[PDB]
Symmetry: D2
Subunit: 268 residues, 4 copies
């Protein structure tokens, strides 16, 4: 079996492929039961959820690898991972990172040019080191760029093909506000484009149909479920503390039968 | 500063002391913000939450340690930990488990007498191996008994005495259904009594006022937040999968500002501004 | 496929010398010395990585850490001592087998240790490991001590049963005569591993002698480790006694040798 | 507390010999040999535990694992090589410092390497490390290679700034004269550590010599490790060339010596 294959196959059977972030192994199983073909391990989520830390580069590759093992050990859905800038700097750092992640169970990962961003060149080597470190060719190397917002469209598209020439299997344009931009990246890069549809950002809540008219090959929802899980956990804590009992929040609680079924308790 | 001292100080300041489970570091910080004085690491939660596996002894000590460090590295609230039966059928194991758990940052832990449960003489030896291994005396060793699920109250009360004698700092009487049962353990054990007020169990949803009348020292809610977290998560998944958009789910989502405040984001930025 | 590389080493070298590597650095020294397969001793993980006696105190986690460190830098197929599966439940053996393979190992062995469990008990453990296996090339070796315990009659029977159960190779403990390995090889009908550790009961059989015995693998679990400790103790002692390490400089690997062994310049080249 | 134990060891021995222990087993050997403090070499974690060069490839997690393994079984206070803090920001330094203490370390040293950062940058790393520390007895050592990179003046200027910033002790590199060590001790006014590693440009100073130079600590980072690698290689080569280890039996630690060092019989 090859998670890299499963991922590439998912984008093939679903367009745009809906990829939802799963904060932990339990939610990965839920996402599966909901019919999702692929999941995501958000870097911001590992920091905020697993570590209770802001997304300021305090988490480490190890924190990330732990969640990949937990998730991919029980959930077979191909897992797309946020590998940031490689957590290292040199070629062997990017390589060790890419191999670690793949070995942990990932199906794909994405590295970004955000140092402002790095030069086209340096990002080109970063991608080469990533592609070179890859053992399974089906493993997906995604290149995330923020050049559009930094250097402008022209420079953005230039990097696009540059990154693709280096071997990036897919592109991840960040902070896009207009579908047009997606079609352009698709027309130039000519590789599966990913639309990050996260909430409370500068991007509109595009629907799968809208994203399709723009040629988007993947629709990402990084923290969607996490944001809802926090609001509900907070409600439980709040009510329990005020009322001295959780009686009035039982109705918003997943039942046992539900928990057991989501984790195949009975089966064991 | 000791976490064990913090746990004990929490008890003296809140009676009964509400101890809520936090499935991860983020929720621990939420619990702290909600005003709680102590938190809990559920073994069933590590299994089902962190591993997505059933609570059937599949999780290892390492899975637990990882969650203990993550939680206690960012949240100062004393953490009570479910050490199951000691992770290891050997006395050596129990000792290494106790020391490792404390080192990971826990303030307390509870070890149980399950094998059906083991005999008194048996449980008494596990308790002794744990108290022996403990380096910091303030670190709490709570003794949990599941006798009430297959035995009568009297039988359960008997063990309670033997457990305390071995060195058990506190008692965790499982499956109690009558307020008076708590009172009897409190009067026989002579040490703080914890009441597991988890949902969908044989134990009624007793209120803090009810438990207080029964002389209960701690009120435990092991997976409460976790259960509501799962439902809401699923809701988002289902809708997003049916309507190809999360638009109709925005209203039940924690806002960016709320997320940032819970993890002290602005505070980190402040320190940078300072430089 | 690490399992595929392990089987190819078996076919290429007969008997195949499998030396223990206490850590990633020694795995590279072994590789540079020409070895085709290495070993991760469970007794090594306890005494070396944890400083604890080999009495069941280490956990699967301690072992997975060493497997990753070793396989993340050394490509040689690694045979791992998995004891009895770490746990007691078929779920534990399966989770252990998968974990070990995922960590990067090429093979592992499990024993009928509880006195030894019953044949049926072991057979189930083996079946559990074989079914948990994802890569059919990943090797599952069955270690047994039936000979000493229950005698040859029962031992030879367990052997066949283990093989019928799915064991790719056999690791029969307590053998002191080549004629006995020969017998075990004929019965089992799968590669036999001979444990040539020192300070034990088994003679220090040579690769030639083992070959004449139909032995497929020669294992040296702690050999390098034993020597590294005596040398280390020597440095600690002299330095403490004399207030300088001047007189032990001659038994030390130089910095150039260390750099060379880990390919220092090829990395700095990338940088 | 380990920090208390480290300072107690320093108070009772002059200079305090601190030998590196590559793993838990060697920590125990150092202990049986009479040492009162041991060290976890950063280059040792890389070359020994990871089989990689000391070029910034190891992560904080690799170091932490070794600290726990060693300190869980050996009570001798452990001085840890925290490199530059395993991160670029003060947040990384704080997380690194707390994690290392939590793992069981008694003290750590952080350096000004990047070329070296400006005096001001190092002053900030130290301040973050000092602020992150929860137990004042836990030692924060400042390591500097400014002597070789910038010269005497810059080195002494940095030293004083480092002490003013909160560094409990100083680890000045590249000193080749006992007389210069005295100068650093006099200007810095905090315990000075002298690195007596082999095959470098520095002399193999005896403890009596270091004492005359007012040196408070003598460090032997990989001494045992070096000898262990030569012996191990010897076994590997002879066994490969002769087809048996009969001829290297005489350089092997016996089963009883091993059992004795790990207290086998006691557990039994
Ligand atoms: Mg990210
Ligand atoms: Mg439990
Ligand atoms: Mg073994
Ligand atoms: Mg270093």
């Amino acid at each position: 079996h090859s998670p890299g294959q499963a991922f590439r196959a998912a984008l093939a059977k679903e367009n745009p492929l809906q990829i939802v972030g799963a904060i932990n192994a339990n939610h990965a199983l839920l996402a599966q039961r909901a019919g999702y073909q692929a999941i995501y391990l958000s870097g911001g989520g590992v920091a905020a959820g697993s570590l209770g830390l802001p997304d300021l580069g305090i988490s480490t590759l190890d924190d990330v690898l732990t969640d990949i093992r937990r998730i991919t050990d029980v959930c077979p859905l191909p897992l797309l991972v946020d590998a940031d800038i490689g957590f290292g700097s040199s070629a062997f750092n990017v390589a060790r990172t890419v191999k670690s992640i793949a070995k942990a169970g990932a199906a794909a990962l994405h590295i970004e040019d955000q140092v402002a961003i790095v030069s086209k060149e340096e990002m080109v080597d970063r991608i080469r080191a990533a592609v070179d470190a890859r053992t399974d060719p089906n493993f997906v190397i995604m290149a995330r760029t923020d050049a559009l917002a930094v250097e402008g469209l022209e420079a953005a598209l230039d990097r696009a093909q540059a990154y693709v020439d280096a071997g990036a299997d897919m592109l991840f344009p960040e902070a896009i506000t207009e579908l047009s931009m997606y079609r352009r990246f698709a027309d130039v890069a000519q590789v599966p484009i990913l639309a990050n549809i996260t909430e409370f950002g500068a991007t509109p809540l595009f629907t799968t149909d809208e994203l399709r008219s723009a040629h988007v090959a993947m629709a990402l929802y990084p923290l969607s479920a996490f944001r809802a899980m926090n609001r509900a956990a907070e409600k439980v804590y709040t009510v329990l503390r005020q009322e001295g009992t959780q009686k009035n929040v039982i109705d918003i609680m997943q039942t046992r039968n539900e928990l057991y079924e989501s984790i195949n308790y009975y089966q064991f």
